[model samples]
Target chain A: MKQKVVSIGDINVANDLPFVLFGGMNVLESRDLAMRICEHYVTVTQKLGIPYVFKASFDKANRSSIHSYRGPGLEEGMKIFQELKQTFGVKIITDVHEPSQAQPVADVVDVIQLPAFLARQTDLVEAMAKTGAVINVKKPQFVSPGQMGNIVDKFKEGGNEKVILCDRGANFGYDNLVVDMLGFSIMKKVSGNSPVIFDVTHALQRAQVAELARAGMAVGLAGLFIEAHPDPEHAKCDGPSALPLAKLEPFLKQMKAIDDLVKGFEELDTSK
Target chain B: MKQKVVSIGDINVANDLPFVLFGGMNVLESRDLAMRICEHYVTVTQKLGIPYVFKASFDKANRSSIHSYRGPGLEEGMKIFQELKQTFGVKIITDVHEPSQAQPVADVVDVIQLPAFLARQTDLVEAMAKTGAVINVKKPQFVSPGQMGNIVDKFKEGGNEKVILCDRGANFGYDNLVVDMLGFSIMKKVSGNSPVIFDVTHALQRAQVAELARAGMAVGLAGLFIEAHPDPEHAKCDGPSALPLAKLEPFLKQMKAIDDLVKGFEELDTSK
Candidate 1:
């Protein structure tokens, strides 16, 4: 199968490419916090020689509680994305909740994300498709990997080609989440031209950071979507899931080594 | 926590109840077919001394193909359910897709089911709640087990207290399902006295019969929900998942043994 590449600036994101790092905070709590976090990620990935994309949500629209911390809305988030891109000289990725937010946000950020819960919303998909930005589609916690074809088809029909699939965790039982490593290959087959990545940050409940990242990389993912915080214990959102900023280098070192070893092997025809 | 008991004629269904058997076909293919399948289930469940509730969908509203068979519509399905009740002297359970069908269907069946996909629909929940019929809410493939509380609250807010949680496996990857056995205890705690049953039929893709069944029962389920077809390969829908008619006896025998052994154990509080 021919590999499909989703170019975010100079970075070539494909299953065969050295795995890209999409890492940042869960939601941008403040501009200073964003700078500190992105600098840490940028330094680590650059040292590890991994392709990187800066990722953080401007607004977490679907938090369980109504009063949950939603970061700087689209207007202010655009400024932060623009600043991050310039300061770090990196490609930026953030999510869009409404159709109206797509164009302006897409214009500012290198990649526009389709939030998992809103992945199938026709209007949102259409608007995102029309942006012509490389799309990062977070696989919904509830949807099967095979069902992703429909989402990909929706994007294709809307005339977008640069779509990437991000596997967060699936609902295991209750608040628990499990990462099925086999899903990477299945998404590869079903999504056709789309590159698939593992969202390692959300699947933290199942396994440790570097451990889960290696499992995802071994499955031949295009990249790893992770979140890190300088101070996880007191971080505003999803602190438990945040990889401590100090561990970023060691974590990515392990991930890079795994990706190299796995990607080095010649393709096998086990199915036949 | 006080356990709530949902009664269907002489049968008592609760989290602590000796695991009941809610089993039958995917759809009521025909009156004759329903009778044949229900007879076998009745005979096997009777021999096993498992409290049984006959289950089949009157209308499978969400078929993959538009032309798929949808069973006998409500009017005819009510008749078939009535006949099965009188002939086998068993309680009956069937799902309803629309709000309008809830009251009428509840009048005929002992338990009106909330289909997985429609579990969160406010109108349907309210309508089903008004019937005062015991409810079996199929956990949506996409929802986490802990999220069942929101659904349970919806039922309670609508004034319905007789609710049972049913797990039909969760989306593992795509076209795949995984039974997270840990979910059973979680559901029992969160649903506030509602019994939880495993819908082993839909989750058959995960494993061979005994493996999945034993795993589910060991988690301390209120019961097991299963489907059987005389000839699974030729069954109208979900043929691959249908338990072959011949396998019913041995299958239930294994499930019964596991349930008995597991249920017989005294509570061990490892958490403390």
Candidate 2:
């Protein structure tokens, strides 16, 4: 089978490519914040020579409580997405909560995201597939790696196959989440060698952005997904987990270094 | 704070009580097998002087796919449950998938369970509550211990409060299920000290049933829940995990001793 590299406006994203960074704030808090975050991301990626895709959510549709900032709705959110594309001159990625938002969101952003919770929804996957945009499927916190093959098959059956599988983490114990560094290849193999990415911020409540990235990136992925804020302390999501903008360059430098070292290694036949 | 004890007929189940055994087979494979499994459980539990409740389902309601033996439906399941009560003279515990099944299930069994997947469904929770029989709330593997507080609240608001919180395990890694010994106390605290029991057999693909049960029992559970089959290899469910009837007496003896020791200990003031 030919390696299925997703073309996000010429930024080739495949497991073997220089790991792309899906970087930006978690939510489009405002047009100004979106612009500010993407500008910093664009500047950082340009300096580091890392392939980049802007990440933000139009709606944080699944919040703990009813009262919290869900991003600007689809209308205003896409307006900002379009502006970010024009300003940053980079590919954009954002999650879609409902089936209806897929077309319009895909129309603006280069890549449409399927949040972990909505990944299992048939209507939404089909609706997104019909748009023919590259799909980033966030492996649900509850879904096993093997189950992701079904979700990937769903995308193909829904009329698209350029799907990216992501692991935010899985739910276990009581309060903690586990990111399977070992299961990255399993996710890839299960999805018929689909590009698998690791979302760093969601998996950690600690200051180990670079540390876990080493563990996950060492496993060799197609991309690294993270949320960087101007001041992580004031970000809409967990401030501790979000990468502070002041440290963005150094973090990427360390991550890029790991990627170069890990991806450079020859494949080993260690299974006995 | 008061110890919330649930009474399933004459059996007084509380975190402080000598742990009760909610034991039987996974599915009601047949009336004969149900009788066979229950006879062994009843005999051994009586021999050991442990409070015992017979467990099985009229339906395995949620199997992986459509085509496994789903056991008898509501009509046939209740019929067998009644026979188990009459013949073996043991209390019955079973699970209900629908809101409607709650009433009739409660009418028959000493306890009716809300399956993990349906733990969050409002209609089913309320319906289960109205039965006034003890509701075994199978903690959803996807749900964190804290969120289980909401499900416990739902049962109370619906009509009743006597509920047992059973932990099968949480989905930690891609391929494994984890029972958090630490989370048992949290589940108890979160659910206002509801009877928190460990479903050890379901959590294991292990020979470490004794080890895991020791860890869970030491946490001071109100009960120990497990499924036993005569021929483990030939059982309908995960036979490897099921306790063999030959090993029932010793397994219960080990579990009973652990529960007695742990529940007998005095509480420490650890919140300094």
Candidate 3:
């Protein structure tokens, strides 16, 4: 099946373009906080002349502690995303766990992300793909890159193939994660022609979890997932992962500079 | 670049053979304890009859705390492994971290294990491979399976064709880890054709260290890395990741069952 590359607003991302991904938005924050975070990204992208897809998980379906507040429930969360999209005039994306919530979430967001934990669910993936929206699937660290074909095939079987495979950190020990660069090459094979993105923010998050089960991902997310706020530490929540919006300019500049250094090597023909 | 698979004792583990993995032979209270662990494993394997390799890390290099005791160090530890080999007459494996220690360790163990933390050290890997010892390089959680090609290439350059890529897990946000199965295919592509093994014990031990820092890891290594102890919890070191020595029979049996079901489709032939 032919996979479709997608464009979020004016940013063309699919099988053909070389694009970078920015994430680590604080998911547990209030709607106002989430909206400000999105706006920060939109403003930063415009200043840097970089194309971006705003990603903040509405609900951390897999939080370690049951008491940890999952982002505002889906209903209220979508409203904040709508405001961000309307005000910032930029594309939005978030993650979902079940197959049933795909269509409704897809209606508000440009892309519906599938967390790595649920990446292999055939019915869930197909259900998301059927929404006719871009499906950003994180590669589960447990499976190999070759296994992704089975994942993408579920979408192809349903005749909706706009699937982009993302490489978050794969499981290393219990608490540690490592990004498989080669998996990026192999994931491209699964996309056939879909754009492959490297998530920089999640990579920099520390291996600490907050409280008992609450992930300690906040502090580490600061510089890596660099979003701007005057003071991220004092921000309502997610003080760890959110980048100070003001500091992001230099971060994006450095990113572009590094990206330019490795420009041509990105297109690795694994078939050889 | 052709991949070479080596035989673990009487079992042939070529590319064509099914995945042959070893269970960690942790420290035991006495030589009799060691014999029991070995005898039980042999009997269990004989009953279900499958290829196997025995594993034990000499030192817990990445322990979470300073108070934690690293393994038996080099002196007394190798002596114990030597006795285990002399008595049980089974193929055994152990790990090394620094470059200077490879040759001495190689002189004793059948296969040399390179820890996940040092997976990228060119000098360390080349040093280990030079011993002509079969190298089972555990994929680090910092990098993806796809990125391992560059590290594996260092071994091949040493004129060593015997290599296996083992996956433990990856670091996710904070202490939480998510396994990406995509690594299997990616590592195969990077390793060319090296055999890949999924480390069950280390993956579980990871959950224990999920909270502790590197120093704390040294403290937890007590019963976790030892031999013959059934419950890692009550014993000493690594309690979280242990397979409950008692549960080894069924756990291993189930893992091999997955191998039997999926082994036929394990090849990574991109040209197909």
Please give, for residues A97-213, the per-residue lDDT of candidate 1 as tens digits: 667888998778888898775665666677887888899888977777777887887788777889999998776654668888877778888988578999887776423777778
Tell me the tens digit of each residue's lDDT in model 2 across B1-272: 66798998888999888899998888887888888889888899899899988988787542432334656889988999888788889899888765678888777888878777556556556667677888898887777777777777767776688989989887766557887778888888888898988899987734688888888888788888898778876544442288888999988888878888777888777888
lDDT of 3 by residue, B1-272 (tens): 44456654465554445555565565434556666777777677667866556666556677778897677787777787798787766667888888888888788888777877787788888888788888878777777778888777788788776777777667666664555656665776667766766654555543333232222122111011213345566665653355556765665555455555554554456797
Candidate 3 per-residue C-alpha lDDT over A2-36 given as tens digits, one digit per residue, 9 for 90 to 100: 33466655656643334444443757366566666
Which candidate, 1 or 2, would have the higher DockQ against the true structure? Answer: 2
Q: Pairing residues by index, what is the TM-score of model 1?
A: 0.58
Say which prediction, candidate 1 or candidate 3, comes out ahead on DockQ: 1
Question: In model 2 chain A, where is the ten-residue run with the lowest total lDDT?
Answer: A61-70
The TM-score leader among the candidates is 2
Better model by TM-score: candidate 1 vs candidate 2: 2
Q: B174 in model 3: Cα distance from truth in Å?
A: 16
DockQ of candidate 3 compared with the true complex: 0.07
lDDT of 2 by residue, A126-148 (tens): 77879999999888677777777
Clash counts for all predictions: 6, 0, 71
The better candidate by TM-score, 1 or 3, is 1
- TM-score order of candidates, top first: 2, 1, 3
Clashing residue pairs in candidate 2 (N, C-alpha, C atoms within 3 angstroms):
none
